[PDB]
Design a protein around this ligand. Structure first.
Ligand SMILES: CCC(CC)O[C@@H]1CC(C(=O)O)=C[C@H](N)[C@H]1NC(C)=O
Ligand SMILES: CCC(CC)O[C@@H]1CC(C(=O)O)=C[C@H](N)[C@H]1NC(C)=O
Ligand SMILES: CCC(CC)O[C@@H]1CC(C(=O)O)=C[C@H](N)[C@H]1NC(C)=O
Ligand SMILES: CCC(CC)O[C@@H]1CC(C(=O)O)=C[C@H](N)[C@H]1NC(C)=O
Ligand SMILES: CC(=O)N[C@@H]1[C@@H](O)[C@H](O)[C@@H](CO)O[C@H]1O
Ligand SMILES: CC(=O)N[C@@H]1[C@@H](O)[C@H](O)[C@@H](CO)O[C@H]1O
Ligand SMILES: CC(=O)N[C@@H]1[C@@H](O)[C@H](O)[C@@H](CO)O[C@H]1O
Ligand SMILES: CC(=O)N[C@@H]1[C@@H](O)[C@H](O)[C@@H](CO)O[C@H]1O
Ligand SMILES: [Ca+2]
Ligand SMILES: [Ca+2]
Ligand SMILES: [Ca+2]
Ligand SMILES: [Ca+2]
Lengths: 389, 389, 389, 389
């Protein structure tokens, strides 16, 4: 049976810890994939952590140079949420240096992008086998979400980008049923930049909060209807949530336009709450350290700076990284609404640390009816490792 | 289908060995979580060992300082009973430095407590996802059983404490159905202290034998009715079963009050047998070494010193630690009564031994219709380990 | 549904290789239990290798002194047939330094013997939990088959011994249904000695070929009826199949009495074939090296020396050890008869080799309609290991 | 339910990456079987990688001399496609130094060949147990496909060879139902040589492209009908696809006869496409380096040199090796045709490299409706390994 996912996102007062994998600490001795870009997505029966391996293990010579993003060895794999990305519990998914994945109620669909930068191929898998593909349409690192795609009533949606990472690119919405592409649209967004969308279902639509890697320190927003018409813009709130970013005091905000005039960025997320927004961000304005989430009153629909809740999940003495959105299936939560959850990637190694390698672990949080106290569920691994000596 | 668990506890003459995981011996070479606080609980299909990891492995540098109780890295995980807490067979449960877990016949409910000491959060999971929470109500290390909680006809019960570990604290009973809290009560117990309850079903009620960490060397007793009224007191028997404790000769006993005038303690258990009691305890009066279980005639209902059976499972030349109660589902035993079983934690490392780490393994015993001979199924690991050199 | 196992044993011309685990070779680097006494038994869905661990791993310091037979750390565990006894694929069964196990069509029954030599306890498990026990009845190392027990129409049978290993002991047949003992008998056998029976179903009865560790170099035979009456004696054939043994030329044979006047022995097996017998044995008369199986015409019912088939599975340049019998379920083979299969234990280390440890691997063979060529599927590990240096 | 597999092979424009196991890179630290001869085959539920172990692990002393082809330690095992051949995820299949395997819709059938060169035994397993055998009929290394066998409507077909590897041998087709041999035929092919067939279903027949290890640099072709009549010859195309081979310019081609006058070879594959052919081959004419696949117009039915598509999957700076064919079940793809897929073995170590060992990893590709860009998904391991120093 297909997951409906037509419900509204639950309104939440805070986020409770779901899981923590401790992958890099475990990987000091155990047999753990060197990874990055982990993310969580759920079937009616379980949630899983997906991750992009470097085709190599922590504390091994082959983990050298893994700060690098793309290689013929990178693969999309998965384990149960909270499990480390160890070899012996991992399910192979796809050959990928960029990925998205989601379940439609019947089977898992995964999308793994691999191949040369100038002519990359995205392979769509459904039920454990290749069923369709997408070739690069702009010849410049075809790529996608690095978090859960979104299935509503049996059709699954995701966002892809092809083109420059620092100027105007091209962006598309794809739609599949049972692993077969049944629709696609170009996203018109001149002056804007869309990368690494974090999406979720809400009121029968797909809402996405993404990454502007061009000029914006506020995040692009994309609301997708099943017919593939869309509304695109920026998260209205007068609070910048990208990294690097400027100070809140010096930021104005816009529903339509990038602001902040800074390059680069980091994958991040947001949840709509009626007209409010939960927005995640690193504590540091310049570095990928710390992680907090703010509820901005009316932040979804106007340039509001009215912060009504704030919760810290990783302190600023510790490394963070990417973050992304997913929802709990009604079949698992037992709710009449979609429980909003997020994950935080905690990057260790290069370029910040004294190692030959780069990897990451994850902490997972889910929205609840209560305020949750500030804490830090940081990575906690002790660097350098043996292989670095 | 919900497990009824309305039957009486089986009357038993002795305890047969169920399992032994050999985790620390195996962990000399294999990939085994550094743990403590293990415990067993059963679904209609299998029994599992739950444990609190230190988010690190035996014989690794990250096992340093693991004598410590609370950290952001500790997680509740589980394997099949008798299996070591190895990485590759473990199921993630919750983020936790204190935990309880039980099955209701349909799904597993787990409760993991993490967060800061002053404002800890307990997260209730059901079927593998967060479904509810409990915030600290007294701001002082919210905490719970460290053994199986108890499900009767679909509702699950457990005991939590919030407050000082060495003076008057606050104690509560919680009740859930399908991962959702449907009831709670404050336990009135001025002059008494309740920690780390070991519970089990008996005649449609939840019986608990707990730990007084304040003044008592006898164990608090809590009998919970489904409506959440309760009777609370001390295990009547004129035999002290906490550690540290005084000599039996110098102990009087009380059904209502703590006795012994000593601080500290250790998690322990007891089974009612009509009006008798099976009470477990360390052989040593001062240290966590050895383990024996005594059947005291009329020990549940009066200050009796009449020991009618005694069985040793770990000798006094060897380290023990915590111990806890669980029952075999009727669906597994095939009995018309609930088979009483217990587990013994065997702690190795600090503070007693010459290592940088603390962990433990477990032996599991189940009540039978026969007397069982004394023996010692001790941990058997050879310390120090390589990482200590 | 219960397995009937009322059919006749298939008549076979030879034995084809089923499996080989390579446990000790793999254990040079992988995480493998130090074991001995492995054996195979089958459910309607799969065959599994059971084994007695030493609660320690190959190439680890804790594998020291594992030539020893009994300890509090030994456990019965299992994996799929052909898999090594690695940690990460193993299912815990029982605490045991002696064991038997078999499936009744619905669930696995296992019997693990542990405890002190003078008062050992056998624990019967069914469906993964303790359901019954047997206490030592003669106070001298209660012990059992070390191979598959035998289930016919839902009732399971096995043979146990209690008493001296080198003089007259006591021997019993046990019968269980669903993990509960429903019958037992003393085996009258003055002058004879029964150890480590290898049994199988045949024509609605349990046939066993065992080990005389007292005076006999021929093997005791036990035919058990469901009502627990029995016939007991020695395998008639004028060929001795125990180890150590004398030369064939100097052996007479007897259906009723031990012959050969030598102490010690080794677990071995035999299959009835009408009135013929397949008998396994080490090639060496004195040492546990090599393995061959002979079909002796009329060897089951008379002192025949007429060898009609001979097949070698391990050459005499290589170490062997125990061997045992099991049958393929009709539900798996698709036959109208019970396929006879055997396993051979290949012991490495002490006392023959230059190591601190003793372990073993296994090769598994199943009867077919064809002659199979001689070969040697020996252990192949290269000793000493690192831990021995 | 039996898989029909009566459909036509899908016509494909290119091949998308399915999987990559990274076994040898992972094996630098993890616990990975030393293997060779991997291959993929699919049930209605999943595809699996089968492989022949050396009964030893990467980076262990026992991996020494593994350039060798046949030993008593080699076993057929399997994991999920894309997973490394690690110990802890592997399912035992058969004792084998040559193998084939396929699923009939109900259960897996495997065929493992082991024993002495002069009298080898092939054991057929079905549903996890031995059900039948084939003894050497020509006394000279009985052997088979090293890729998926082929099941059509419940009957499974494969090709075996017995005899010289460099002159006229003997070749047979076998047919089984539910693990039982129900038919066989001798293949008449004087002047020709058939090894290591790569087969697949097409229009209710079994098509095979094989290896001539005698004189031919073009590949033998075998089309098998269910009644076991056959047509045998050579892949017509005027392009040689064996290794070693001569230049394309100097090759003529033949539907009936070997051409090229060179010894040796390598396992390879081909897919019929109407009258066209997809033929795989190493880029190098002399060495097992690189891998490309050519679509030759009318290449199946005439000596055509008309190359209409070309796709590279491993560049000529990198080691390749064997390659083989399989199809996606309709039950998995959702197609009305059989999706053609292939795997490429990437051999590392001896004789080309500076190690004591030989192993390999694999990349898997499946036919799609699109052209796929050239790339190289090479092994990527860094040699020598620690054990080589
Ligand atoms: C800006 C998104 C993308 C453009 C190619 O680059 C990602 C940058 C990045 C990061 O840590 O900021 C990590 C990713 N692995 C990059 N993605 C790819 C497909 O190379
Ligand atoms: C006395 C119970 C509890 C109060 C916070 O402390 C436990 C003491 C303990 C022990 O070995 O006696 C081990 C536990 N890990 C402690 N529990 C917590 C939640 O810190
Ligand atoms: C003779 C059977 C038994 C009597 C206690 O001893 C077994 C001897 C043995 C061997 O290799 O010959 C190995 C077993 N582990 C012994 N069994 C026990 C229960 O100690
Ligand atoms: C030519 C096929 C076969 C004849 C015995 O030899 C195979 C050669 C080979 C190779 O890499 O070319 C590898 C295989 N393991 C060989 N097969 C066997 C059964 O020895
Ligand atoms: C031994 C080895 O391969 N070292 C390389 C180093 O030379 C290279 O410059 C770096 C990439 O940036 O990656 C390491 O893996
Ligand atoms: C290298 C390292 O981290 N060593 C620390 C030690 O300095 C610290 O005092 C102790 C905690 O008590 O824990 C060890 O882990
Ligand atoms: C370091 C250690 O424990 N060595 C012991 C050795 O002293 C003992 O004599 C032998 C048993 O026979 O077993 C080894 O394990
Ligand atoms: C220590 C050892 O066994 N070394 C052997 C070597 O002597 C032998 O010549 C070679 C086979 O070719 O295989 C290695 O395994
Ligand atoms: Ca930006
Ligand atoms: Ca106390
Ligand atoms: Ca004897
Ligand atoms: Ca050739």
């Amino acid at each position: 049976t297909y997951m409906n996912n037509t419900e509204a996102i639950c309104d939440v007062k805070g986020f409770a810890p779901f899981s923590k994998d401790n992958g890099i600490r475990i990987g000091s001795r155990g047999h753990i994939f060197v990874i990055r870009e982990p993310f969580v997505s759920c079937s009616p029966i379980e949630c899983r952590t997906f991750f992009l391996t470097q085709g190599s293990l922590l504390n091994d010579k082959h983990s050298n140079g893994t700060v690098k993003d793309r290689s013929p060895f990178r693969t999309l794999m998965s384990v149960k949420v909270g499990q480390s990305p160890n070899v012996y519990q991992a399910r192979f998914e796809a050959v990928a240096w960029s990925a998205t994945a989601c379940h439609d109620g019947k089977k898992w669909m995964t999308v793994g992008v691999t191949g040369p930068d100038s002519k990359a191929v995205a392979v769509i898998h459904y039920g454990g086998v290749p069923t369709d593909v997408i070739n690069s349409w702009a010849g410049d690192i075809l790529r996608t979400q690095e978090s859960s795609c979104t299935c509503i009533q049996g059709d699954c949606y995701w966002v892809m980008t092809d083109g420059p990472a620092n100027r105007q690119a091209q962006y598309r919405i794809y739609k599949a049923n049972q692993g077969r592409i049944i629709g696609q649209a170009d996203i018109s967004f001149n002056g804007g930049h869309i990368e690494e969308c974090s999406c979720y279902p809400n009121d029968g639509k797909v809402e996405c909060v993404c990454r502007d890697n061009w000029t914006g320190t506020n995040r692009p927003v994309l609301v997708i209807s099943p017919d593939l018409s869309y509304r695109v813009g920026y998260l209205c709130a007068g609070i910048p949530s990208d990294t690097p970013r400027g100070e809140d005091a010096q930021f104005t905000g816009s529903c339509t336009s990038p602001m902040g005039n800074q390059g680069y960025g980091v994958k991040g997320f947001g949840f709509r709450q009626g007209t409010d927004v939960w927005m995640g961000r690193t504590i540091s304005r310049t570095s990928r350290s710390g992680f907090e989430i703010l509820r901005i009153k009316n932040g979804w629909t106007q340039t509001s700076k009215e912060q009504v809740r704030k919760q810290v999940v990783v302190d600023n003495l510790n490394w963070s990284g990417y973050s992304g959105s997913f929802t709990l299936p009604v079949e698992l939560s037992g709710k009449d609404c979609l429980v909003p959850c997020f994950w935080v990637e905690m990057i260790r190694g290069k370029p910040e640390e004294k190692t030959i390698w780069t990897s990451s672990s994850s902490i997972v949080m889910c929205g609840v009816d209560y305020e949750i106290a500030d804490w830090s569920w940081h990575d906690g691994a002790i660097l350098p490792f043996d292989i670095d000596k």
